[PDB]
Amino acid sequence: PYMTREQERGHAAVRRREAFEAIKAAATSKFPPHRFIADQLDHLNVTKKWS
Amino acid sequence: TARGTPSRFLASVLHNGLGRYVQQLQRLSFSVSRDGASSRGAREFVEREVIDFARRNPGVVIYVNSRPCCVPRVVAEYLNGAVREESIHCKSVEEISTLVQKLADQS
Amino acid sequence: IGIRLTLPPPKVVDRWNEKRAMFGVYDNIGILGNFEKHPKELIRGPIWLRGWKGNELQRCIRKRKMVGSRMFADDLHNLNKRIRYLYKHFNRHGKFR
Amino acid sequence: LVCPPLRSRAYTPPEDLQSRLESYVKEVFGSSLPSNWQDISLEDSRLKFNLLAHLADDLGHVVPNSRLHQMCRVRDVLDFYNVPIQDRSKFDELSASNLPPNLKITWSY
Amino acid sequence: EPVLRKVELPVPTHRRPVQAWVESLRGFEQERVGLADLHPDVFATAPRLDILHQVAMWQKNFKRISYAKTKTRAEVRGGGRKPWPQKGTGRARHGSIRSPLWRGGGVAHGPRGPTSYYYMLPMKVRALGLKVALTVKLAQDDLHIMDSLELPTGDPQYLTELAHYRRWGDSVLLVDLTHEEMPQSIVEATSRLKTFNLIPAVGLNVHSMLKHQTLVLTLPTVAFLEDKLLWQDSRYRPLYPFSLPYSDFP
Amino acid sequence: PVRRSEKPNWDYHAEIQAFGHRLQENFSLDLLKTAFVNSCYIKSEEAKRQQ
Ligand SMILES: [Mg+2]
Ligand SMILES: [Mg+2]
Ligand SMILES: [Mg+2]
Ligand SMILES: [Mg+2]
């Protein structure tokens, strides 16, 4: 091997911590989507007809 | 199914590759209506893209009936006379543009 | 064959007559009629349902209790067998128990 | 009794309309006392009525019911009239457009 | 001369009212005679097409009561005996006739007598359905207001040409406050025709004005439903049905 | 079968023009129409004109 047990002890704890916190932020970010008057009233345009 | 359907050997119409290329779509005949909610895709397609479609392809000729129709239709015949009709009933403008484009592309 | 060879006659649809033109009127008599009346006594129908909802059992028990004395013997006999078969059905048969 | 010919909804703004409406604004308001008349307000209905009433019957264009409540100050009325409006069928304007020869559109009525 | 209406109810400080034209039917060319400011909260509510969906189809549904019915295997006549022995013959096991399988037999799961689709929405939702109904009419310039429904000629010909001369639409509603004060001229016109219907203010609903392509009010009627729907907006908690008396409310 | 002119959705002048653009040729319509016209159709044209 390249490194010893006590050599490779605490070198990657930063990445594994920040990576897990990203999963936490991804899990908390859960809501319904945003509604709009645009996408609501575009259904009215089905009866758009020529003069 | 292959056996139930007819087949053919691959061939082009009068060898359009060597000489000057000609758009082998002859005519398009749109059937839209002043009413009918399904015709929103065809009418808005007539407004924006059918103009530019004609400017892009001066060779092809286009006709629009604009008569009462419960379902809009689009008819397309080629130089050989092979008529092929497809239904544009309740389709978006983007789909119709890609549909008319591939019709212009095919033989 | 189930289909019909010849078409049916074109049924004329009169979208402007007495009913459809005056449809939906006098439904808000309580909201802007100083609440002199409720919209539930407006509807024309049987006496065992005038502004009230019920399932098969609920409408049957309300029927026999209200108008069952006026119902026929055969119709009343079929009614008792109906609720008896439906009483045990909803209670014993089905999921969620 | 008698129905005169209908008025066409189409309307285009004639030249020097700003001078025409401004001459009437000074007629309604003796004289326009404060400068910067474009920011003058129409909180009162009598002032707004006599203003919009003269504009319609003189020019031939009516403000809809949906916009007069938005016409708070006079410059908004200026922007509503300097923009044009049209009235012709889609078949009429498409045929009026410089369509190429290969394109044709019909009208089966 | 002009006829102005100023709102008698209070308005929010952060929402100004909305002006609207006023007309009449004495003359033909007479248009834009009088103005009337209107409360914004009732004439400028959000579109809320979902509200219109519920309340409009609600009055399509709760008045409906079915009458379809199918006789069950117990109700169809006969089918008491067993037609043949369980193991005696090759024929399939069948306890009696009139089962759902046999010809002419009763239905197992079919319509059951006169059903009732009656369900009452909240009064605030139904009221707000009325608030938003004439609101979108004001956005689309579909409604109209006038002083009173009097005309000297009083015939369908004058009424029809007056409509598509001002370019209202094909189908129109006429509104009045009570059932008694309608003039005999306008009512005899609407009775002969069908499209330009007439209703009182009490029978006002969203479905009729949404079916008809335009709407018409009178100034007494505008103040009437305004007082009702704003009273619904500032309403007090209902402890009991409003049919019984109150201190201030009649 | 019949001629495409007999069948609907047909404009004569627009078709020869659109046809000329198809095969990449541009010149006077007087020369085009004189080429497409045959002597036999003129016999039927004047025949139907007299009758
Ligand atoms: Mg039995
Ligand atoms: Mg027995
Ligand atoms: Mg048995
Ligand atoms: Mg039966």
Question: Cβ contacts (< 8 Å) between B64 and chain D: which residues?
Answer: 104-106
Candidates E134, E173, E202: best to mutate against C (most CBs of C within 10 A) is E202
Say how many residues make up chain B: 107
The rounded distance, in Å, linking the Cα atoms of A1 and A38 is 62
Question: Cβ contacts (< 8 Å) between D69 and chain E: which residues?
Answer: 17-20
Q: Do A46 and B35 touch (CB under 8 A)?
A: no
Give the CA radius of gyration of chain D. Answer: 19
**Angle formed by the axes of helices D74-82 and D17-28, nearest 10°:** 150
E in contact with D (at least 3 C-beta pairs within 8 A): yes
Reduce the secondary structure of E233-246 to three states and give it as a string.
HCCCCCCCCCCCCC
The rounded distance, in Å, linking the Cα atoms of C13 and C20 is 11
- Do E220 and C43 meet the contact criterion of CB atoms below 8 Å apart? no
Tokens of F36: 């497409």
- Do C72 and C78 meet the contact criterion of CB atoms below 8 Å apart? no
Tokens of E247: 């201190």
The rounded distance, in Å, linking the Cα atoms of E152 and C35 is 36
- Do B42 and B72 meet the contact criterion of CB atoms below 8 Å apart? yes
User: For residue D35, how many other CB atoms are within 10 A of its CB?
Assistant: 7
- Do E43 and E18 meet the contact criterion of CB atoms below 8 Å apart? yes
Please name the method used to determine this structure: cryo-EM
- Long-range pairs for E132-137: beta carbons < 8 A, 24 or more residues apart: E132/E45, E132/E46, E132/E47, E132/E48, E132/E51, E132/E52, E133/E52, E133/E206, E133/E209, E133/E210, E134/E42, E134/E43, E134/E209, E134/E215, E135/E42, E135/E43, E135/E44, E135/E45, E136/E47, E137/E209, E137/E214, E137/E215
Q: Which amino acid is at D79?
A: D
The rounded distance, in Å, linking the Cα atoms of E147 and F43 is 75
**E198: which strand partners?**
E174
Q: What is the CA E12 to chain-centroid distance, rounded?
A: 29
Q: Do A37 and E47 touch (CB under 8 A)?
A: yes
The rounded distance, in Å, linking the Cα atoms of D54 and D17 is 13
CA count, 13 A, side-chain hemisphere, D103 = 19
Is A40 an interface residue toward E (CB < 8 Å)?
A: yes
| Residue pointed to by tokens 């406050």 | E177
The rounded distance, in Å, linking the Cα atoms of E126 and E121 is 7
Question: Cβ contacts (< 8 Å) between D106 and chain B: which residues?
Answer: 63-66
The rounded distance, in Å, linking the Cα atoms of B12 and B21 is 12
Say how many residues make up chain D: 109
> What residue spans define the domains of chain B?
1-107
The rounded distance, in Å, linking the Cα atoms of E241 and E218 is 30
Q: Which amino acid is at B9?
A: F
- Do B21 and B93 meet the contact criterion of CB atoms below 8 Å apart? no
Candidates C16, C31, C50, C53: best to mutate against E (most CBs of E within 10 A) is C31
Is D28 an interface residue toward E (CB < 8 Å)?
A: no
Give me the residue from E116, E127, E241 closest to C59, CB to CB: E116
Tokens of C62: 């309300």
Chains B and D: how many Cβ contacts under 8 Å?
A: 37
Q: In chain B, positions 44-103, which contact chain A (CB-CB < 8 Å)?
A: 44
Task: Compute the C-alpha angle B95/B96/B101, nearest 5°.
Answer: 100
Candidates D95, D99, D102: best to mutate against F (most CBs of F within 10 A) is D102
> Residue E157 in 3-state DSSP?
helix
- Do E124 and E45 meet the contact criterion of CB atoms below 8 Å apart? no
Give the burial class of E210: count Cβ atoms within 10 A of its Cβ; 0-12 exposed, 13-18 middle, 19 or more buried: middle
Tokens of C17: 């007559």
Reduce the secondary structure of D17-46 to three states and give it as a string.
HHHHHHHHHHHHCCCCCCCCHHHCECCCHH
Domains of chain E: 1-250 (3.40.1370.10)
The rounded distance, in Å, linking the Cα atoms of E211 and C21 is 9
Q: Which residue in chain A is spatially nearest to D89 when comparing CA positions?
A: A51
Helix, strand, coil shares of chain B as percentages rounded to 5? 30, 20, 50
Evaluated on CA atoms E37, E173, E26, D5, the torsion sign reads positive
Reduce the secondary structure of E171-215 to three states and give it as a string.
CEEEEECCCCCCCHHHHHHHHHCCCEEEEECCCCCHHHHHHCCCE
| Residue pointed to by tokens 């001002």 | E166
Helix, strand, coil shares of chain D as percentages rounded to 5? 40, 5, 50
Instruction: Please report, to the nearest 10 degrees, the dihedral formed by the alpha carbons of residues C34, E51, E9, D43 taken in order.
Output: -150
Q: Ligand 1 centre from E73 Cα, in Å? A: 7
User: For residue E231, how many other CB atoms are within 10 A of its CB?
Assistant: 15
Resolution of the experimentally solved model in angstroms: 3.9
For chain A, the distance separating the N- and C-terminal CA atoms, rounded to the nearest angstrom, is 81
Tokens of D73: 């100050």
CATH of domain B1-107: 3.40.30.10
The residues of A whose Cβ lies within 8 A of any Cβ of D are: 50-51
Those residues whose C-beta lies under 8 Å from the C-beta of residue D37, and which sit 6 or more positions away, are D22, D25, D74
- Long-range pairs for D7-16: beta carbons < 8 A, 24 or more residues apart: D7/D60, D8/D87, D9/D85, D9/D87, D9/E167, D10/D85, D10/D86, D10/D87, D10/D88, D11/D59, D11/D60, D11/D61, D11/D84, D11/D85, D12/D84, D13/D81, D13/D82, D13/D83, D13/D84
- Do D68 and E20 meet the contact criterion of CB atoms below 8 Å apart? yes
The rounded distance, in Å, linking the Cα atoms of D53 and D46 is 10
Burial A21-46 (b: 16+ CB within 10 A, else e): eeeeeeeeeeeeeeeeeeeeeeeeee
User: For residue E148, how many other CB atoms are within 10 A of its CB?
Assistant: 16
E131 to each of C30, D33, E200, how far by Cα in Å? 15, 42, 17
- Listed residue (C55, C52, C57, C79) closest to C67, CA to CA: C79
Question: Cβ contacts (< 8 Å) between D88 and chain A: which residues?
Answer: 51
Question: Cβ contacts (< 8 Å) between F11 and chain D: which residues?
Answer: 104
Tokens of C93: 């048969």
The rounded distance, in Å, linking the Cα atoms of E158 and E30 is 14
The rounded distance, in Å, linking the Cα atoms of D70 and C61 is 60
Q: Ligand 4 centre from C79 Cα, in Å? A: 18
- Do E168 and E144 meet the contact criterion of CB atoms below 8 Å apart? yes
Backbone phi and psi for residue E218, each to the nearest 5 degrees, phi listed first: -120, 155
Backbone phi and psi for residue E23, each to the nearest 5 degrees, phi listed first: -130, -170
> Residue D49 in 3-state DSSP?
helix
Q: Do C21 and E113 touch (CB under 8 A)?
A: no
**Pair type for strands B73-78 and B83-87:** antiparallel
The rounded distance, in Å, linking the Cα atoms of A14 and A11 is 7
Tokens of E37: 């400011």
**E209: which strand partners?**
none
For residue E78, give the ligand nearest its CA: 1
Q: In chain D, positions 63-82, which contact chain B (CB-CB < 8 Å)?
A: none
> Residue E4 in 3-state DSSP?
strand
CA count, 13 A, side-chain hemisphere, C76 = 10
- Do B107 and B12 meet the contact criterion of CB atoms below 8 Å apart? yes
Q: Which amino acid is at A35?
A: R
Tokens of E58: 């609600």
- Listed residue (E55, E203, E221) closest to E129, CA to CA: E55
Backbone phi and psi for residue B74, each to the nearest 5 degrees, phi listed first: -135, 120
Q: In chain B, positions 28-47, which contact chain A (CB-CB < 8 Å)?
A: 34-35, 37, 40, 43-44
- Do C83 and C61 meet the contact criterion of CB atoms below 8 Å apart? yes
Q: Do D65 and E34 touch (CB under 8 A)?
A: no
Those residues whose C-beta lies under 8 Å from the C-beta of residue E242, and which sit 6 or more positions away, are C30, C35, E249
